Amino acid sequence: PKVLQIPSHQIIDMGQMVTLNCDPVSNHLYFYWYKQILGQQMEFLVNFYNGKVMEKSKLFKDQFSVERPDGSYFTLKIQPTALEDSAVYFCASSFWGAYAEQFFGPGTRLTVLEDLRNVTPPKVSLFEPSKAEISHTQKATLVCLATGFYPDHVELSWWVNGKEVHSGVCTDPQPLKEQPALNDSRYSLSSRLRVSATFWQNPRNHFRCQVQFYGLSENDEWTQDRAKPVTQIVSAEAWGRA
């Protein structure tokens, strides 16, 4: 019993249309769109039942389109996209309507930019464990930095001997702005993976920090000299050492 949403991330420039898709619980009759600003304040936009938009808040711009064609996703379409539309949009559905538990999707993170020319993938560096830490604690912390990326659509994961690990890992909850002053600032993100020192010391062990970057697609034009900053993975690797 989980509501689904795609896409998880959307970057778009101004004056366009984007489509937010929601797949509500199979037998639910009431569908909702909400939006969350700056990772906290949650605001109702609009709901839908009996095949029609019903309630709308002051935040709902009627220029937006809300539909649920037979056998297709519940959708919100934002047009023309504006900078102020940037937010995480969450869909929800419920069985009995008002007083029923509303089941929320995982959200779509929409970033609207003035132009796409600044989109830039991360540089990723892996910093190896300190000999002093190993000496003092019998433990070894690897640190990974993803830097210089924009906008801040990334997910970081750690891979040991070709297998993803979660134990021993902690990644900053949010990227930090490199130049707080700017509205166009690039971001950095750090993570640690801590393993027993003897595991880091084993040269048969392979460690990889991986950053999944959400960027441009083939449908986006690119005329600048540097590589097209497409959706891609950037990783840094190292083998354990004595």
Partner: protein, 199 residues
């Protein structure tokens, strides 16, 4: 703000208790929900409370007094997975969207049994020129302050080495500024006098 929540945020030791409070400035909204949201997910209802009194769902207890429109959530035996943003949401008698409070951010922190605060330098695996400073193994109530436009310092982060039943805090700092070094990386923070600074 129709629905008002407090406190703004709260730190709770693992195994500990927490009390979240909520009110409405509008007597029309008398039907309340508590929702929880983890980073990168959508809200998930914990429980509703529509009548005066107490309701229980596992380690969670909600209380409502309609007369005063006081609502609260009480968490017992807090678990690391309880770290989340907690929203009070309400709806009016008479289907509408929910109205949410600003939320309370709850962090459940580990009790560090044998604290061993230290700042280490780690070198880049592809180039020995660049490095970061790792402040680690400090106590969970140590506060890491942000700080110079060209010096970067992350918030403290709890990692859990599951098989060892071992958790530890860390923060990372780095910079290209000529005067930056691990010895002074975290100077704007109050750190234990016995912090280990090797070389």
């Amino acid at each position: 703000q129709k629905v008002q929540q407090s406190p703004e945020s709260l730190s709770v030791p693992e195994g500990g208790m927490a009390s979240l409070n909520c009110t409405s400035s509008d007597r029309n909204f008398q039907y309340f929900w508590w929702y929880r949201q983890h980073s990168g997910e959508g809200p998930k209802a914990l429980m509703s409370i529509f009548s005066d009194g107490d309701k229980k769902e596992g380690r969670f207890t909600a209380h409502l007094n309609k007369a005063s429109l006081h609502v609260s959530l009480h968490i017992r035996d807090s678990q690391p997975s309880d770290s989340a943003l907690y929203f009070c949401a309400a709806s009016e008698q008479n289907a509408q969207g929910l109205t949410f409070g600003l939320g309370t951010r709850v962090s459940v922190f580990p009790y560090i049994q044998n604290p061993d605060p230290a700042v280490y330098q780690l070198r880049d695996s592809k180039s020995s020129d660049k490095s970061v400073c790792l402040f680690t193994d400090f106590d969970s109530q140590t506060n890491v302050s942000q700080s110079d436009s060209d010096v970067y310092i992350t918030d403290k982060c709890v990692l859990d080495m599951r098989s060892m039943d071992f958790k530890s805090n860390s923060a990372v700092a780095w910079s290209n500024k000529s005067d930056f070094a691990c010895a002074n990386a975290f100077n704007n923070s109050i750190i234990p006098e016995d912090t280990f600074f090797p070389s």
